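Input record (Table S2, row 198):
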Amino acid sequence: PQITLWKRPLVTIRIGGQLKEALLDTGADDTVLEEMNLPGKWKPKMIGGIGGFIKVRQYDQIPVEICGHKAIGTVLVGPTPVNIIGRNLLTQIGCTLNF
Amino acid sequence: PQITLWKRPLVTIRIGGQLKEALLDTGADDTVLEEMNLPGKWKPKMIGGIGGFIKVRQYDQIPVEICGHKAIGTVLVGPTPVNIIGRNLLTQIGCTLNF
Ligand SMILES: COC(=O)N[C@H](C(=O)N[C@@H](Cc1ccccc1)[C@@H](O)CN(Cc1ccc(-c2ccccn2)cc1)NC(=O)[C@@H](NC(=O)OC)C(C)(C)C)C(C)(C)C
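Output record (DR7 complex):
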């Protein structure tokens, strides 16, 4: 699909057996999801945005479906106001910026 | 052009007669530049990201050339690690996300 930027580029994702709304974010190195209790080992990490750093849990090799396109990679989980799909997954579905 | 996302989508912009590198950011509502002087009256504003809120200077109706494409719009200036081009200007240059 082609997604215009008149509104926030929110799409449906599937993860851990839940459907969620997430922002397709070319300004994000990493994928950061709202708090959820995924199974498996994780590692602590601190990630920084505009207002400073937050503590997140890093989970590896989590399958994520983005608009019916399959992806698998690292997901960070923590106190974010919005679910963010970053470049680590956007590359996997062949996402480009075009103008 | 078509820009892939295996690296950060940094492009050269021209603003106030100066050249700067900036991130094309579909997850940003607003355009936020590192601290710099711009001509004209500004008003204090607050904007929020991950890590919380920051105070910025809001400048209205600033021309910005993004990879040779002209935009004129609101530019915020404040403490950011990277220059961010957000949706307010991305829409002006006809930028879309495609996969
Ligand atoms: C209405 O809210 C917004 O649109 N808020 C904004 C914002 O922070 N956007 C976020 C996504 C977002 C939206 C709304 C609420 C919370 C978060 C991103 O589009 C841009 N942001 C802007 C940003 C980009 C880079 C950096 C940075 C950090 C360390 C070293 C180099 N750069 C910091 C902030 N990037 C990041 O925060 C990412 N950071 C990142 O990839 O760090 C490398 C995360 C996500 C992985 C944390 C702006 C201030 C830019 C307008």
